[PDB]
Amino acid sequence: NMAIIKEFMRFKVHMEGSVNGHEFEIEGEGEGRPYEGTQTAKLKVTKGGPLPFAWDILSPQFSKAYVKHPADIPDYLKLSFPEGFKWERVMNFEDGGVVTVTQDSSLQDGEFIYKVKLRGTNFPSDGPVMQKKTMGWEASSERMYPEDGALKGEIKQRLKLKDGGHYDAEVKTTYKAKKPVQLPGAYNVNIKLDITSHNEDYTIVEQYERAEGRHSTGGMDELYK
């Protein structure tokens, strides 16, 4: 009973990282409804705070078990549990900033356990990340496809800026089950991540995400599966 995916699941997360050489750690806890595609988390900076950069570059690194999938697509990442999966991401921002991430996901004692390692580099001094001028992510579409025995996703991800401008990243992620799992074909995932509350210096932050997979081929019949 401590090794299955219930309709309500909690998670714990630890992140160690650096951005432009500034080392930090985060610990958090979350919860959500994996088959509905919804989740929330509360994150706390436990080393290196206050962070001298925008929280928003970290927020997408805190949970793909909580994606609502069509009934006729193998839910590769759910299927990988309890052992779980690993993911690796590269984000290329339009001003030369780069974020690379690796992550381990497992199911232990009835909760998901996430361990994240992050390296952000080359953010410019007069850009919005190092000056905390961002204001959350627009909804995204992640184009998923199998490749080389893993599941890949690509996103053109748009960060809102306080001045009404926008700031784009190109993102690629590899998601790989720890044991062999049947891979899906290509499909898309619609995602929206919100920061629902935070303290003044973003050392305590609450997030919400909704994510839903959809077929990208198959005509009307493959809609709303």
Partner: nanobody
Framework: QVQLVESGGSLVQPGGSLRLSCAAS????????MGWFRQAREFVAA????????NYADSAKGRFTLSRDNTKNTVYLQMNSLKPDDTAVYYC?????????????????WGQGTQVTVS
Amino acid sequence: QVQLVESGGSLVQPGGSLRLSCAASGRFAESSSMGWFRQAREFVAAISWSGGATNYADSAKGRFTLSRDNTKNTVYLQMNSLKPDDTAVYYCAANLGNYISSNQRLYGYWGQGTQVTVS
């Protein structure tokens, strides 16, 4: 696609035992987690696609056992200590999301049912 074919329903005596089967076929049979529901629908027990996790409704725990032959994508529900009120049509259903709990709406593929009578 996943197709499910059940077998094994029979008449047994009170206190008796039976073994039901459900064979999954189709492109996603290897990824099919299978759950049994009975309709006199109510959850009975389920087993993950890998055969490695099982979950039993309260009334089934300790007297029923589920197993999976991964080479045939077939599951077996061994029912012991059966009583008249276990009489029902037993359905097996499947999902591709590693779900083995009681919400029937999370199983999108259904077998045809098999009749168990205890009397």
